[PDB]
Structure 1
Amino acid sequence: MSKFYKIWMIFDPRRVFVAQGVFLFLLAVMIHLILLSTPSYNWLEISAAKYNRV
C-alpha cells in the first residue's frame, strides 16, 4: 500500500497525468449525461416539474 512511489520511477509523469485527466473528464461527462438520460435523475427536468416551469 504505502509503496506506490515505484510506479512513477518507470512511467512518465507528464503522459500519466494528461491521460488520467482526460480519462477522468470523459468518465465524468459520460456519467453526467447518463444521469441526464434517465428521467428519474434529470435534475433539470425534476426542477422543472417541481416548480411548474412547463
Structure 2
Amino acid sequence: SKFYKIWMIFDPRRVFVAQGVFLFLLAVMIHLILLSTPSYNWLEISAAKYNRV
C-alpha cells in the first residue's frame, strides 16, 4: 500500500475538484462518441425498433 502519502503533497481540495471535472468530461465524451456512431445511438435505435421515425 503506502498510497496514502499522496495527500501529504497534493492539496486535497484541488485534487477532488480536478478529479470531478476530469470524470465528467471523460463520461460525456464516451456518451457523445456513442451517439455519433449510428450503431449505438440509443435514441435513434429505439426509433427503428419501435417503428417510430
Task: Sort the TM-score into its range (normalised by shorter chain).
Answer: over 0.9
> Could you tell me how far apart the structure 2 residues matched to 1:28 and 1:45 are?
20
Tell me, yes or no, if structure 1 residue 45 matches structure 2 residue 44: yes
Percent same amino acid among aligned pairs?
100
CA distance in 2, matches of 1:52, 1:37: 21
Q: Deviations over 1:25-46 (max 9, x none)?
A: 0000011000000000100011
Query: TM-score, normalization: structure 2?
Result: 0.95
Instruction: Give the aligned length.
Output: 53
SS at match of 2:8: coil
Q: Which sections of structure 2, spanning at least 5 residues, go unmatched?
A: none
Q: Which residue of 1 aligns with 2:34?
A: 35
- After TM superposition, the score normalised by the length of structure 1 is 0.94
Deviations 1:2-48 (A, max 9, x none): 22100111101000000000000000001100000000010001101
CA–CA separation in structure 2 for the residues paired with 1:32 and 1:7? 31
> In 2, distance between residues paired with 1:30 and 1:53?
27
